[PDB]
Design a protein around this nucleic acid. Structure first.
Ligand SMILES: [Mg+2]
Ligand SMILES: [Mg+2]
Ligand SMILES: [Mg+2]
Ligand SMILES: [Mg+2]
Ligand SMILES: [Mg+2]
Ligand SMILES: [Mg+2]
Ligand SMILES: [Mg+2]
Ligand SMILES: [Mg+2]
Ligand SMILES: [Mg+2]
Ligand SMILES: [Mg+2]
Ligand SMILES: [Mg+2]
Ligand SMILES: [Mg+2]
Ligand SMILES: [Mg+2]
Lengths: 114, 82, 127, 98, 100, 151, 207
RNA sequence: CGGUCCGGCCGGGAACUCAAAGGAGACUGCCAGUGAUAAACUGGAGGAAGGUGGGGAUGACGUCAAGUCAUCAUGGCCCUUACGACCAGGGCUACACACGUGCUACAAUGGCGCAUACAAAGAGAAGCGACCUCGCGAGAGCAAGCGGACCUCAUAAAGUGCGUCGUAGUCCGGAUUGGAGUCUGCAACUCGACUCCAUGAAGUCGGAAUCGCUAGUAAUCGUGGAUCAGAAUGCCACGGUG
C-alpha cells in the first residue's frame, strides 16, 4: 500500500488513508478519489492493484510528499535570505503572521524556559 | 493581500523617482518613506533607503524582492534581547 | 362545532382546534410523529388526553409558531387543556391536579449587563 | 389607496393624534380602516454611565418608535385634501402615501 | 478632544464633501472589470495623489459637543456621556431608561 | 437555604416508562442540556441490560441501583476544633439520587466505547456487585462504619 | 455617585421631554445638535432673564421653542423686538423658520432650575453659601413645595477640602416615580473654582 | 365558507395567532389551624399567576481625600517662535518572561457526511442588498425590493433520521507556517479580517490553589446589535435546548 513514496494505512478508508501522504488533506484526497472513480467508504483492504495505480498517478499530478516539503522549505529559505520582516520572524522563531508575542507565541516560540 | 484586479500598489513619487533613476542609471540611494509600496521589476538594481520610523535603512533591491512591499526589508523595531 | 384553545409555552404560540370523534393529531399540516421526532414532546402533547378519557374520542388540528420543540409541545398541551376546559368545564378538577392548566410562566431570563448571561457572573480574581 | 403611517415616540400622543386624524378622515369623506397598531421599533442603546472605567456600570436606554397605520380606501375630494393642511402636527411624523 | 482635533475633523469632513464625486468616479473606474488596465492604473494614481483627508475612511466620528473619539453613537452623533446627560435632562426625544 | 425551607420541583416522569426515578437518572446523565441524546443513551443501556439480564427493563435497573444505594454516609461537624466525620442515615429520596450519580461517574470513568454501553455495563456490575459505583458505595459504608464511634 | 437623574427616571411617567419631536436615523443627530446650540444661545442670552426649561418642538420643518421664564417682560422687551432678535438667531442656528414662545413661571422659587441659578448667582457675588441655601429653602416652603432639597458641593467659602452641604426641608421622595420631583443643577464658577448646586423640588405627588 | 397554479395566494373573514392602546385580575381578599383575641406564619381552595408571582429600573446618610483635570467643565500653577499647530513615516500590535479575563480544545453525550424540523430578538438608504449568472470558496457581475410586521441581512444551531469512524495523539484537536486568493479602504510590509489548498503544535480533563451558578438558572447551542470603510473569541442584547 505505497503511494507517492510513503506507505499508506491498510485498514483506513481511502479519503482518510490518502491524507497520510504529505501534501494531501481531506479535500485533495476526495478529489483524487473522484479522479480515480472510487467511493470514499472503501478501505485499502479490498482495493485492486489497477485501482491503486490510477490513484497513484492522480496523486503524482499534484506537488506532493517530498517535493512539497522541498518547495515550502525553499520558500522559507528564500524569505530568510531576503531578510524581509517575515524572513526575520522565521529566523527568530517568532510568529510570522502578525500575532501577539507579549503573550501566546508558544507554538513558534517553543515551550517556555524560565 | 492586495487584489489582483486592483493592480499591485506602488507609491507614485517612488515610481517616478525610480523611473528617473533607471533612465539615468546613476545609482545613489533613493530616500523613501512610502514603505507600503510593492517593489517593481524596474526597481531591481537600485538602492532604496526605506524609512523605518527613525532612519532610512538602505535596501539594495534584488530580483527576489519584487512582489514584496518596501517596508518588508526595513525593520521598524530594534529588538535584541531581554 | 370547533371547541378550541390557545396554547403558549416559552416563545411558542400553539393554537389547538379540537373536534369530537376519532383521534388524528395534525401539527402544522404534518403528523405528530412527523413534526415532533422526539418522544417526550409527543408524550407531553398526549398527556392531558391520557389523563382525561380519550382513545378515538376527539381529533385535534393544531398549528404552532415560535420556540423550539419542547416549548412548542408545552404550548400545544396548554392549548389542548384550554380546549378541554371550554368543552366541559368540569375537567378543570383533574387538570388542576395534574398541573396542566398552568401556563408555564418561565421565559428565558434576560441577559444582564455585567453578567455574561442572566445569572452567570464573570470569573472573580480577588487579588 | 390612502396609506397614512404615523411615527412617534410618546404613545399617548400618537393615539390622540391618530384619533384626530381618523376623525378628520371620516367626517370629510368616507371609509377609513381604523388605527392599526404596527410593531414598536425598540432601539436599545447601552452606554457606559461612567466617564472612565467601570464598564459593568451602565445605562440601557431605548427609543420606542410607535407606528400607526390609518389606511383610507375612498378618496373624496374634500377628504383627501384635508389630511395635508388641516391636521396640524405635534411631535409626530406623518407619512401619507397614495 | 482638543480644539485642534475638532478642527482637523472638520477639515476632513469638508475635503470628503469636496472630493466625494471626484474620488468616487475613480473608485468606480478601478472597480470596472470591463475596462482598460492602463486607465485603471491612472485612476489609482490619481486617487493616491488626492488629499487623504478627502477619504471618508480617514474620518473619526467624534462627539459633536465634546469631540470625544470614542463611546460614539450615530443615532445621536454624541459621546455616550453626553447622550446620558441629554437623556437625563429630556433633551433626546423618545429616549428613556429601558427595562425588560 | 438559611430561611427558605422550600418544596422541591416536580419533574416530568420518563416518557417511555412513566418512571420519575428514570427521568431523574437521565437528567443526571445529561450534559449541555442534551436530555434528548442522554435519554436515548439511557434507554439503550436499559435495553442492553434487559437483553443480558432477562428480568425486565426497569426492574433490573432498580435492582442495580439497590446494590449501589448507600444506607449511611459521612458528614462533617467540628464541635471542639478537630475533624469529626459523623455518619448520618441518608434520606431515601437523596439515597437513590446519590447512587445514580455514582453510577454515572463510573460510566464516565469506564474504558468501553459507547456511553450507553458503558452505563449498561455499570448497571450489570451493580446488579452482580463488582463495578465502580458499588466499590464507591462500599468505601462510603466503611467510612461511616469507622466513624460509627461518633453518633 | 449613584443617584439616577430625577427628571430622567420619570421621563415617561410624570415628566415631559424638553426636546419633543420625531426624526429618522439620518437627521436625528443633526436635530439634537441644533437643539443643543439653540439651548446654549438662549442660556447665554437669557442669563439675567430667569429662564428654567427651554422646550423644543419642531413640526413641519419649523422649530417651536417654548421658553419657560420667571421674567417674560425682559425676554419679550417692548412689543417683540427682543423676541424678534432671538427668533432670527434661532432660525440662523437651525436652518428652518423658527418660533419662540415665552411661558411665565409663576412662583419661580418653586422652579428648581431657577432656584439653583439664584443660589449660584449668590455664590458668585460672594455671600455665605449656607445662608443662601437656607433662604432658598425658606422661600420654597413659603411658596408651597411639598418638600425641597438643595445641595451645594466643593470649595465652600474658599475651604481647601471640598465639603458637600445640603438642606432638605419637607418630603422629597426620589424613589417614587409618580412624584413630581422637579430637579436641576447649576455650576457657580467662583474665585475658588466650581461650586455645584443641585436642587430637587417635590412639587407634589401625581396620579 | 367558494376557487384552484395546493403558495394565505385570492374573493373574503373577522374568529384564532399576532400587533399595540385602554382596562379586569393578586390584596394573605376568602376557608382552616398556630399565634396575646394582634401582627403575622403554616396549610387549603379558587385562580394563569400566591403570599414581594418572575425579571428589570429604582442605590438612604455616608464610607474609601476610591476613580476620572484624557468626555466635559473648572481654581491654581506651568508652557506660549513651544509642553501650541500642520504633515509623512513609525509606535501604541515590541517579547527571556509573570498575572487576569475569554475562546477552542483534549473527543464517541464526539467528529465527519448526507437528509430534515423548530426560534426569538434586532439592524438596514454614502445602507441592507433577494432572485439570475460566474466563482470549489471568501466573494464578483447584473440588479429588483425596502427608511422596512411588506424587502433584505437570513438557510438558526444544538436537535432529529440514516450512514460512517471504534478509543488511536485518531477522520479528535485546531495552533503554526508555506502557497494561492477575496474584500474593505489612498494604503493591509510593520499590522486587518475572511477564503481555498497544504501544513496538522501542544493538548488524552489540568499542581498548589480557585471562580461562577438555586430555574427556564447553570451548562450548552446558536442569532443579532452597537462602534465600524474594514477588523470581534470582547461587550450589549435575543431566543433554543435544558
Ligand atoms: Mg497529510
Ligand atoms: Mg441561554
Ligand atoms: Mg478644549
Ligand atoms: Mg475609521
Ligand atoms: Mg446607578
Ligand atoms: Mg423600591
Ligand atoms: Mg501620522
Ligand atoms: Mg493597547
Ligand atoms: Mg451592524
Ligand atoms: Mg477535524
Ligand atoms: Mg504530546
Ligand atoms: Mg440567588
Ligand atoms: Mg464591523
Amino acid at each position: 500500500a505505497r503511494i507517492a513514496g510513503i506507505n499508506i494505512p491498510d485498514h483506513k478508508h481511502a479519503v482518510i488513508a490518502l491524507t497520510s501522504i504529505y501534501g494531501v488533506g481531506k479535500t485533495r484526497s476526495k478529489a483524487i478519489l473522484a479522479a480515480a472513480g472510487i467511493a470514499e467508504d472503501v478501505k485499502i483492504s479490498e482495493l485492486s492493484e489497477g485501482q491503486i495505480d490510477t490513484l497513484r498517478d492522480e496523486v503524482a499530478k499534484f506537488v506532493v510528499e517530498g517535493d512539497l516539503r522541498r518547495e515550502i522549505s525553499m520558500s522559507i529559505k528564500r524569505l530568510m535570505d531576503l531578510g524581509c520582516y517575515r524572513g526575520l520572524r522565521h529566523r527568530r522563531g517568532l510568529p510570522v503572521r502578525g500575532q501577539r508575542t507579549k503573550t501566546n507565541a508558544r507554538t513558534r516560540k517553543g515551550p517556555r524556559k524560565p | 493581500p492586495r487584489s489582483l484586479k486592483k493592480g499591485p500598489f506602488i507609491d507614485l513619487h517612488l515610481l517616478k523617482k525610480v523611473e528617473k533613476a533607471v533612465e539615468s542609471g546613476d545609482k545613489k540611494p533613493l530616500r523613501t518613506w512610502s514603505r507600503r509600496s510593492t517593489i517593481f521589476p524596474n526597481m531591481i538594481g537600485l538602492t532604496i533607503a526605506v524609512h523605518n520610523g527613525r532612519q532610512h535603512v538602505p535596501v539594495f533591491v534584488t530580483d527576489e524582492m519584487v512582489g514584496h512591499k518596501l517596508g518588508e526589508f526595513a525593520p521598524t523595531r530594534t529588538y535584541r534581547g531581554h | 362545532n370547533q371547541y378550541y384553545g390557545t396554547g403558549r409555552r416559552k416563545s411558542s404560540a400553539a393554537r389547538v382546534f379540537i373536534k369530537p370523534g376519532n383521534g388524528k393529531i395534525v401539527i402544522n399540516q404534518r403528523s405528530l410523529e412527523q413534526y415532533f421526532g422526539r418522544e417526550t414532546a409527543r408524550m407531553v402533547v398526549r398527556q392531558p388526553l391520557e389523563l382525561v378519557d380519550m382513545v378515538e374520542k376527539l381529533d385535534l388540528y393544531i398549528t404552532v409558531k415560535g420556540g423550539g420543540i419542547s416549548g412548542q409541545a408545552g404550548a400545544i398541551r396548554h392549548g389542548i387543556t384550554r380546549a378541554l376546559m371550554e368543552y366541559d368545564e368540569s375537567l378543570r378538577s383533574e387538570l388542576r391536579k395534574a398541573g396542566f392548566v398552568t401556563r408555564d410562566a418561565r421565559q428565558v431570563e434576560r441577559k444582564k449587563v455585567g453578567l455574561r448571561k442572566a445569572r452567570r457572573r464573570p470569573q472573580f480574581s480577588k487579588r | 389607496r390612502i396609506r397614512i403611517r404615523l411615527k412617534a415616540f410618546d404613545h399617548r400622543l400618537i393615539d390622540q393624534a391618530t384619533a384626530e386624524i381618523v376623525e378628520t378622515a371620516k367626517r370629510t369623506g368616507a371609509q377609513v380602516r381604523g388605527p392599526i397598531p404596527l410593531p414598536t421599533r425598540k432601539e436599545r442603546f447601552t452606554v457606559l454611565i461612567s466617564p472612565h472605567v467601570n464598564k459593568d456600570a451602565r445605562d440601557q436606554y431605548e427609543i420606542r418608535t410607535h407606528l400607526r397605520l390609518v389606511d383610507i380606501v375612498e378618496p373624496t375630494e374634500k377628504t383627501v385634501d384635508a389630511l395635508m393642511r388641516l391636521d396640524l402636527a405635534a411631535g409626530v411624523d406623518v407619512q401619507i402615501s397614495l | 478632544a482638543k480644539q485642534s482635533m475638532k478642527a482637523r475633523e472638520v477639515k476632513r469632513v469638508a475635503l470628503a464633501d469636496k472630493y466625494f464625486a471626484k474620488r468616487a468616479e475613480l473608485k468606480a473606474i478601478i472597480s470596472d472589470v470591463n475596462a482598460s488596465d492602463e486607465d485603471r492604473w491612472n485612476a489609482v494614481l490619481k486617487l493616491q495623489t488626492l488629499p487623504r483627508d478627502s477619504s471618508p475612511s480617514r474620518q473619526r466620528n467624534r462627539c459633536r459637543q465634546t469631540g470625544r473619539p470614542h463611546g460614539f453613537l450615530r443615532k445621536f452623533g454624541l459621546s455616550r456621556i453626553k447622550v446620558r446627560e441629554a437623556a437625563m435632562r429630556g433633551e433626546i426625544p423618545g429616549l428613556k431608561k429601558a427595562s425588560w | 437555604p438559611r430561611r427558605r425551607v422550600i418544596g422541591q420541583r416536580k419533574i416530568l416522569p420518563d416518557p417511555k416508562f412513566g418512571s420519575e426515578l428514570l427521568a431523574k437518572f437521565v437528567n443526571i446523565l445529561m450534559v449541555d442540556g442534551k436530555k434528548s441524546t442522554a435519554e436515548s443513551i439511557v434507554y439503550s443501556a436499559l435495553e442492553t441490560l434487559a437483553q443480558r439480564s432477562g428480568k425486565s427493563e426497569l426492574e433490573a435497573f432498580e435492582v442495580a441501583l439497590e446494590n449501589v444505594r448507600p444506607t449511611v454516609e459521612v458528614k462533617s461537624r467540628r464541635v471542639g476544633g478537630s475533624t469529626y466525620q459523623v455518619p448520618v442515615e441518608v434520606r431515601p429520596v437523596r439515597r437513590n439520587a446519590l447512587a445514580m450519580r455514582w453510577i454515572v461517574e463510573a460510566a464516565r470513568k469506564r474504558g468501553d466505547k459507547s456511553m450507553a454501553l458503558r452505563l449498561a455495563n455499570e448497571l450489570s456490575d451493580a446488579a452482580e456487585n463488582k463495578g465502580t459505583a458499588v466499590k464507591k458505595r462500599e468505601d462510603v459504608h466503611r467510612m461511616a462504619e469507622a466513624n460509627k464511634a461518633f453518633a | 455617585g449613584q443617584k439616577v437623574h430625577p427628571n430622567g427616571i420619570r421621563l415617561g411617567i410624570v415628566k415631559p421631554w424638553n426636546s419633543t419631536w420625531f426624526a429618522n436615523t439620518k437627521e436625528f443627530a443633526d436635530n439634537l445638535d441644533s437643539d443643543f446650540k439653540v439651548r446654549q444661545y438662549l442660556t447665554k442670552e437669557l442669563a439675567k432673564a430667569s429662564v428654567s426649561r427651554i422646550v423644543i418642538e419642531r413640526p413641519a420643518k419649523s422649530i417651536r421653542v417654548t421658553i419657560h421664564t420667571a421674567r417674560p417682560g425682559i425676554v419679550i422687551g417692548k412689543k417683540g423686538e427682543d423676541v424678534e432678535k432671538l427668533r432670527k438667531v434661532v432660525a440662523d442656528i437651525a436652518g428652518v423658520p423658527a418660533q419662540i414662545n415665552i411661558a411665565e413661571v409663576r412662583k419661580p422659587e418653586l422652579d428648581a432650575k431657577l432656584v439653583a441659578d439664584s443660589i449660584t448667582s449668590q455664590l458668585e457675588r460672594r455671600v455665605m453659601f449656607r445662608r443662601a441655601m437656607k433662604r432658598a429653602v425658606q422661600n420654597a416652603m413659603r411658596l408651597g413645595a411639598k418638600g425641597i432639597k438643595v445641595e451645594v458641593s466643593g470649595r465652600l467659602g474658599g475651604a481647601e477640602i471640598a465639603r458637600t452641604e445640603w438642606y432638605r426641608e419637607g418630603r422629597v421622595p426620589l424613589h417614587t416615580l409618580r412624584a413630581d420631583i422637579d430637579y436641576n443643577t447649576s455650576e457657580a464658577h467662583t474665585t475658588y473654582g466650581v461650586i455645584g448646586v443641585k436642587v430637587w423640588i417635590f412639587k407634589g405627588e401625581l396620579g
